[PDB]
């Protein structure tokens, strides 16, 4: 997954900035009806032209000159940036050390490289439907997390285009909470804690957290299908050798015994469960628990979190419907209403949306559908405004 020729990108942005951007809807979605003064003007942008010359201190008063300059330059990477304490483009006027970042929309990102600890379907630049099963399942848990135990309803979801998916939520006041709260929620959702260094990455303690209960109820509906259908992870020495090396040892030979007398990958896990029923997670009491087996399942499909992007007030990320030149693909709105019907391969690139319009507004092609999610969130905002 990438782009194949930067030759078209100049003219593509040339037309896009001209007549392919919800400058009305965007000015709205940012300024938020202008309910606050010096609200938009300090809401920052960062722009990146040829050779990736990324530059801070970018902002314009209202939609008109915003457009005019966007079309004057056509930046090739655009980050929305927190409303810092004062005038961004005139930052160096006040006494130094007095310009900082007050209030930021709360951001989240999850990578596909996250799953690379076991991901064997495709590469770091190439994908397939198998890994995308994760981009279909993981978001469900994270979404419903904020949908049922965080008292928010201003959620918005996008897939970057190459690896990550984004969530730029602008909740009533969370836009204006302390970095401490950021780190807090991060710590909260950071359940399976594993990169490429530690093996027993989940020392899940005894008593569960009902959050984890709903997590499980989601796991036993969407993991095993992908696992033993799209991968059949018990296929050769390679995969399960990246598996059995996190396990206690009293039975650690029976699993391989089931490994290499096989014509499928089902009775293996079946006898796994069986011996677990005769295994003792607790030598003390009669609570034979799914600690290790479900740690296995979850860790093999769990949203790996970032420890610095979901707390900092300096990392800025892309704009709604701003092109990712290095995939063609542009920001695709993602919804629970669409999680059951998404495919990454069919959704269009900048090249493809261009060839779409290369045939008045977004009101003709599938871009009006794609921004139905946008204007839907905006509708909710109208309902958010009293």
């Amino acid at each position: 997954m990438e782009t194949f020729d930067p030759t078209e990108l100049p003219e593509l942005l040339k037309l896009y900035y001209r007549r392919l951007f919800p400058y009305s809807q965007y000015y709205r979605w940012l300024n938020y009806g202008g309910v606050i003064k010096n609200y938009f003007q300090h809401r920052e942008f960062s722009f990146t032209l040829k050779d990736d010359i990324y530059i801070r201190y970018q902002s314009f008063n209202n939609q008109s000159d915003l457009e005019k300059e966007m079309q004057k330059m056509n930046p090739y990477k655009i980050d929305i940036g927190a409303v810092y304490s004062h005038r961004p483009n005139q930052h160096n006027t006040v006494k130094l050390g007095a310009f900082q970042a007050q209030e930021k929309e709360l951001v989240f990102d999850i990578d596909m490289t996250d799953y690379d600890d076991v991901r064997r379907c495709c590469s770091s630049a190439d994908i397939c439907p198998k890994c995308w099963t994760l981009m279909t399942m993981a978001i469900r848990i994270i979404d419903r997390a904020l949908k049922e135990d965080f008292g928010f309803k201003h959620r918005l979801w996008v897939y970057s285009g190459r690896r990550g998916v984004h969530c730029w939520v602008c909740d009533e006041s969370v836009r204006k909470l302390s970095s401490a709260v950021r780190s807090g929620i991060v710590e909260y959702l950071s359940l399976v804690k594993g990169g490429q260094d530690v093996k027993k990455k989940v020392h899940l303690s005894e008593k569960i957290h009902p959050f984890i209960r709903k997590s499980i109820n989601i796991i036993k509906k969407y993991f095993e299908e992908y696992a033993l259908v799209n991968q059949d992870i018990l296929e050769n020495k390679e995969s399960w050798d990246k598996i059995l090396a996190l396990v206690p040892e009293t039975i650690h030979d029976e699993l391989q015994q089931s490994f290499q007398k096989s014509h499928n990958s089902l009775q293996r896990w079946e006898h796994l469960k069986k011996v677990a029923s005769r295994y003792q997670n607790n030598i003390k009491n009669d609570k034979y628990g799914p600690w290790l087996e479900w740690e296995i399942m979850l860790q093999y499909c769990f949203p790996r979190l970032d420890i610095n992007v979901s707390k900092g007030i300096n990392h800025l990320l892309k704009s709604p419907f701003s092109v990712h030149p290095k995939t063609g693909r542009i920001s695709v709105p993602i919804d629970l209403q669409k999680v059951d019907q998404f495919d990454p391969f069919t959704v269009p690139t900048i090249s493809f949306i261009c060839r779409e319009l290369d045939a008045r507004d977004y009101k003709k092609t599938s871009l009006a559908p794609y921004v139905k999610v946008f204007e839907h969130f905006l509708e909710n905002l109208d309902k958010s405004r009293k």
């Binding site: 049922e148 008292g151 709260v181 909260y188 569960i208």
Partner: protein, 232 residues
């Protein structure tokens, strides 16, 4: 037992007797030193640690039964006592430490005896979210509360008036996965209520404390308050 238990605030600009001034000074300092000693002797929950203190403290005129608005005697004594000793320890970290730490533990103790209804209602009078659940929710959410946290054993959780919260100040009860969640309105036993009360108290208290220490020179032009200027 008295209204006394309250979060210190709003210096009471009366005008008073010089005698009563130094009296309150000495009294309160005695109480402090004592509490420290009594504490370091035993462990907290021991009933000596209760009996002895609830004897001494009641002896020095600070905790009796119901009376009028604020000009009841012992609450007034507590009030002016603190808001004097404030002028005592504004000249070290070690000092300000010791003072904070001691007042902290005192308030802990002196507060741990109020009747439950008085507890919750005075919390209500304190700030906004300081509000209680309905015990029906105990039945409704026993699974959630018990299985969620390891801070409770079995099914025998007493009839504690559990509390509704904003997560925005739960900043450790939840990130450590120690509580059930209802849209950040987590429900936690009284223990952590005391904890959080005491922590916000420490914070706000230090935040005030530093100010006077940044505003000393006034006393420098008097010498009646020469002992407590820096001589306790």
């Amino acid at each position: 037992y008295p209204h006394c238990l309250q979060f210190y605030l709003q210096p009471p600009s009366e005008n008073i007797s010089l005698i009563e001034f130094e009296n309150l000074a000495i009294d309160r300092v005695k109480l402090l030193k004592s509490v420290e000693n009594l504490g370091v002797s035993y462990v907290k929950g021991t009933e000596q640690y209760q009996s002895k203190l609830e004897s001494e403290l009641r002896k020095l005129k600070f905790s009796y039964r119901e009376n009028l608005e604020d000009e009841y005697e012992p609450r007034r004594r507590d009030h002016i006592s603190h808001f004097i000793l404030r002028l005592a320890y504004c000249q070290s970290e070690e000092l300000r430490r010791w003072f904070i730490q001691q007042e902290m533990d005192l308030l802990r103790f002196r507060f741990s005896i109020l009747p439950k209804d008085k507890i919750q209602d005075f919390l209500k009078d304190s700030q906004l979210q300081f509000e209680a659940i309905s015990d029906e929710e105990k039945t409704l959410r026993e699974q959630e509360i018990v299985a969620s946290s390891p801070s409770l054993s079995g099914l025998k959780l007493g009839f504690e008036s559990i509390y509704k919260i904003p997560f925005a100040d739960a900043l450790d009860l939840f990130r450590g996965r120690k509580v059930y969640l209802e849209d950040g309105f987590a429900y936690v036993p009284l223990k952590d209520i005391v904890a959080i009360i005491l922590n916000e108290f420490r914070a706000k208290l230090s935040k005030a404390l530093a100010l006077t220490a940044r505003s000393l020179p006034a006393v420098q032009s008097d010498e009646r308050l020469q002992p407590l200027l820096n001589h306790l």
